[PDB]
RNA sequence: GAAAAGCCAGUGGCGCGAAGCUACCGUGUGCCGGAUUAUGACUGAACGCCUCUAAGUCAGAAUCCAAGCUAGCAUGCGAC
């Protein structure tokens, strides 16, 4: 179209190592590996000196191009921090008659949900990324789902949220489920 | 002629009748994976925040395409 643009650059910390080839960026830290492709119009992705600056750049701009770059910046920040501490999503039971019972299938990584709305069959759904579900249930509140990838950890929690909707009548009145209560957190020990 | 064994009545009529055929008037059998939609979602800009969407992306239907089933390209072909 028209107009022009220039590069926007983020300091990469020394404690995170990055290596780039093509427009695919590999971010590595002690919490694992995260690899994404930021392909877009007039947009190249390169590492302008390791431990100094991570660069996402474009040499031409229009509304479409500019929109992608801000998004790219947000996404790469999540990866840099995600390889050093990981992200944790927190989900809290609400039930009005049915105790919902959560456990982990360690082999064939999935989270199993018993007694959603009187079902005889335990319904379970996989775990996306090498995410692990840890339960600090206490009273029967918190389920804390921890992995490196912000998107995939959130997606694993999200499929549970879709499942626990009550659709015979009236989602509003029937609050049986475990619902995403987070968009999640910094870090901590325990 | 009768006996006996049969003939004719456009298949004489009647009761039964195998073999054959046939009846949700008899029986038995009739397939499950994937890709997706609707739709809810993720991460997330545009719109520092935020949003299912712009880029990328997930789950998902009596759908669709295999799987499967029927013709077998007679003017496709292989091996022998």
XYZ file of C-alpha atoms (C1' of nucleotides) in Angstrom:
270
model
C 0.000 0.000 0.000
C 1.682 3.167 1.267
C 3.917 4.526 4.057
C 7.093 3.131 5.614
C 8.306 1.498 8.822
C 11.367 0.649 10.857
C 12.565 -1.854 13.433
C 11.392 -2.122 17.026
C 13.810 -3.872 19.318
C 13.614 -5.466 22.735
C 16.509 -6.183 25.059
C 16.972 -9.943 25.473
C 18.415 -10.826 28.939
C 21.747 -12.682 29.066
C 20.153 -15.486 31.125
C 17.947 -16.465 28.174
C 19.608 -17.721 25.008
C 17.925 -17.367 21.635
C 18.992 -18.592 18.219
C 17.271 -17.571 14.993
C 17.324 -18.939 11.471
C 14.879 -17.738 8.829
C 11.873 -16.130 10.560
C 11.669 -18.954 13.091
C 12.900 -18.119 16.570
C 13.964 -20.723 19.087
C 13.984 -19.596 22.710
C 15.698 -21.884 25.212
C 15.883 -21.727 28.984
C 15.784 -24.140 31.931
C 11.970 -24.575 31.778
C 12.215 -25.944 28.235
C 12.123 -24.953 24.588
C 9.600 -22.781 22.744
C 9.661 -22.329 18.971
C 7.318 -20.118 16.927
C 7.319 -18.615 13.432
C 6.419 -14.925 13.134
C 6.112 -14.848 9.308
C 4.264 -11.773 8.045
C 4.441 -9.225 5.203
C 7.674 -7.196 5.044
C 8.575 -8.729 8.398
C 11.806 -10.537 9.121
C 12.902 -11.792 12.516
C 16.531 -11.832 13.565
C 18.649 -11.679 16.699
C 20.752 -8.533 16.751
C 23.566 -9.800 18.990
C 22.771 -12.521 21.532
C 22.328 -11.345 25.118
C 21.871 -7.791 23.812
C 18.808 -7.366 21.603
C 16.102 -9.549 20.131
C 14.716 -7.793 17.057
C 11.411 -7.999 15.218
C 11.474 -5.659 12.282
C 9.782 -4.463 9.152
C 10.931 -2.037 6.518
C 7.505 -1.104 5.186
C 4.316 -0.578 7.120
C 0.603 -0.415 6.612
C -2.210 -1.173 9.112
C -1.966 -4.932 8.474
C 1.837 -5.019 8.908
C 1.923 -2.776 11.991
C -0.767 -4.800 13.770
C 1.306 -7.985 13.441
C 4.493 -6.429 14.887
C 2.880 -5.351 18.200
C 1.416 -8.865 18.513
C 4.815 -10.413 17.713
C 6.461 -8.362 20.498
C 3.832 -9.510 23.021
C 4.219 -13.160 22.027
C 8.024 -13.269 22.187
C 7.959 -11.669 25.670
C 5.799 -14.548 26.852
C 8.323 -17.054 25.502
C 11.366 -15.385 27.061
C 9.724 -15.313 30.474
C 8.021 -18.693 29.894
C 11.345 -20.506 29.537
C 12.597 -19.047 32.851
C 9.585 -19.473 35.161
C 6.702 -20.975 33.182
C 3.066 -19.910 33.356
C 0.466 -21.276 35.713
C -3.275 -21.170 35.270
C -5.490 -21.562 38.285
C -8.971 -23.009 38.140
C -11.407 -23.247 41.006
C -14.274 -25.707 41.522
C -17.842 -24.506 41.872
C -20.489 -27.160 42.504
C -24.046 -27.120 43.787
C -24.687 -30.829 44.326
C -21.996 -32.934 42.686
C -18.435 -33.222 44.116
C -16.140 -33.061 41.089
C -13.083 -35.233 41.595
C -9.846 -34.422 39.813
C -6.798 -36.630 39.453
C -3.898 -36.921 37.006
C -3.250 -39.806 34.664
C 0.555 -39.570 34.675
C 0.834 -42.109 31.868
C -1.044 -40.800 28.818
C -1.009 -37.207 30.150
C -4.589 -36.143 30.760
C -6.751 -34.717 33.524
C -9.697 -36.866 34.554
C -12.974 -35.452 35.776
C -15.366 -37.678 37.688
C -19.025 -37.032 38.431
C -19.699 -34.016 36.231
C -23.504 -33.825 36.388
C -24.099 -37.460 37.367
C -22.105 -39.089 34.515
C -21.146 -42.699 35.161
C -18.233 -42.391 32.705
C -15.194 -40.400 33.778
C -14.500 -37.845 31.026
C -10.892 -36.912 30.463
C -9.087 -34.778 27.913
C -5.358 -34.685 27.081
C -2.720 -32.217 28.231
C -1.310 -29.910 25.560
C 2.416 -29.166 25.927
C 4.412 -31.066 28.597
C 2.079 -29.344 31.098
C 1.517 -31.125 34.418
C -1.522 -30.667 36.635
C -0.756 -30.253 40.317
C -3.597 -30.099 42.811
C -3.431 -28.121 46.017
C -7.103 -28.929 46.569
C -7.327 -28.121 50.298
C -11.106 -27.649 50.853
C -11.578 -28.502 47.130
C -10.608 -25.230 45.494
C -7.377 -24.837 43.560
C -6.063 -26.832 40.621
C -2.836 -25.290 39.311
C -1.712 -26.219 35.824
C 1.934 -25.378 35.127
C 3.903 -25.539 31.873
C 6.185 -23.291 29.803
C 3.909 -22.378 26.868
C 1.339 -19.676 27.719
C -1.096 -20.609 24.924
C -1.115 -24.409 25.235
C -1.412 -24.462 29.039
C -4.400 -22.098 28.732
C -5.943 -24.285 25.981
C -5.734 -27.438 28.131
C -7.615 -25.626 30.920
C -10.036 -24.153 28.349
C -11.283 -27.543 27.069
C -12.345 -28.368 30.637
C -14.239 -25.046 30.707
C -16.118 -25.993 27.489
C -16.979 -29.433 28.913
C -18.397 -28.206 32.205
C -21.056 -25.988 30.603
C -24.585 -27.254 31.266
C -26.760 -27.145 28.222
C -30.059 -28.907 28.978
C -31.409 -25.674 30.307
C -29.758 -22.729 31.853
C -25.986 -22.292 32.061
C -26.624 -19.413 34.493
C -28.314 -21.476 37.217
C -26.083 -24.549 36.963
C -22.610 -23.782 38.160
C -21.312 -27.377 38.366
C -17.823 -27.388 36.902
C -14.292 -26.177 37.337
C -13.785 -22.855 35.636
C -10.732 -20.843 34.610
C -10.158 -18.239 37.309
C -6.853 -16.944 35.984
C -4.829 -15.592 33.063
C -2.031 -16.404 34.929
C 0.502 -15.204 37.425
C 4.171 -14.333 37.965
C 6.055 -17.086 39.872
C 6.664 -18.239 43.440
C 8.167 -21.242 45.235
C 5.175 -22.967 46.827
C -69.821 -106.026 -18.796
C -67.883 -106.853 -13.679
C -63.330 -107.762 -10.917
C -58.743 -105.384 -10.782
C -55.960 -101.316 -12.514
C -57.519 -96.893 -14.617
C -59.463 -93.165 -18.517
C -62.603 -88.353 -19.439
C -64.845 -83.575 -16.813
C -60.129 -77.609 -21.467
C -55.916 -79.021 -14.193
C -63.059 -82.891 -12.402
C -63.492 -81.680 -7.107
C -61.551 -82.300 -2.239
C -57.760 -83.382 2.136
C -52.490 -83.655 2.355
C -47.923 -83.221 0.088
C -41.862 -83.038 -0.663
C -38.215 -80.589 -3.686
C -38.357 -75.492 -5.423
C -39.851 -70.616 -4.694
C -41.553 -67.217 -1.015
C -43.569 -63.710 3.866
C -41.326 -57.586 9.565
C -47.811 -63.789 6.969
C -40.674 -66.755 8.861
C -35.595 -65.737 10.185
C -30.849 -63.048 10.404
C -27.712 -59.057 9.305
C -26.782 -53.905 7.989
C -19.542 -50.620 9.099
C -15.721 -46.200 12.011
C -11.744 -43.294 11.358
C -10.284 -38.583 9.651
C -11.095 -33.635 7.865
C -14.408 -29.621 9.428
C -19.152 -26.607 10.238
C -22.274 -24.362 13.515
C -20.529 -22.965 18.063
C -17.673 -22.184 22.421
C -12.517 -21.273 22.910
C -6.779 -19.980 23.189
C -2.955 -16.616 22.775
C -3.427 -11.681 20.947
C -3.090 -6.960 18.147
C -5.547 -3.473 15.551
C -7.380 -0.425 20.061
C -0.098 -0.231 25.530
C -5.674 -2.418 28.441
C -9.127 -5.797 25.976
C -11.268 -9.264 22.399
C -12.920 -16.644 18.790
C -9.165 -13.301 14.333
C -6.237 -9.354 12.076
C -1.241 -13.349 11.714
C -0.899 -18.048 14.100
C -4.256 -21.878 16.691
C -7.695 -25.873 19.733
C -12.052 -28.746 20.547
C -16.008 -29.797 17.519
C -22.104 -32.077 13.539
C -27.652 -36.875 11.287
C -22.222 -32.839 7.625
C -18.250 -34.090 4.186
C -14.187 -37.651 2.516
C -12.121 -41.967 3.365
C -12.890 -46.578 5.955
C -16.568 -49.913 4.154
C -20.049 -51.664 0.379
C -21.551 -52.131 -4.947
C -20.098 -51.313 -11.250
C -14.851 -52.600 -12.472
C -11.650 -47.849 -16.461
C -14.937 -53.032 -21.526
C -11.005 -47.085 -25.310
C -6.411 -47.700 -17.485
C -2.588 -50.989 -16.003
C 0.579 -55.145 -13.558
C 2.254 -60.077 -12.725
C 1.763 -64.808 -14.711
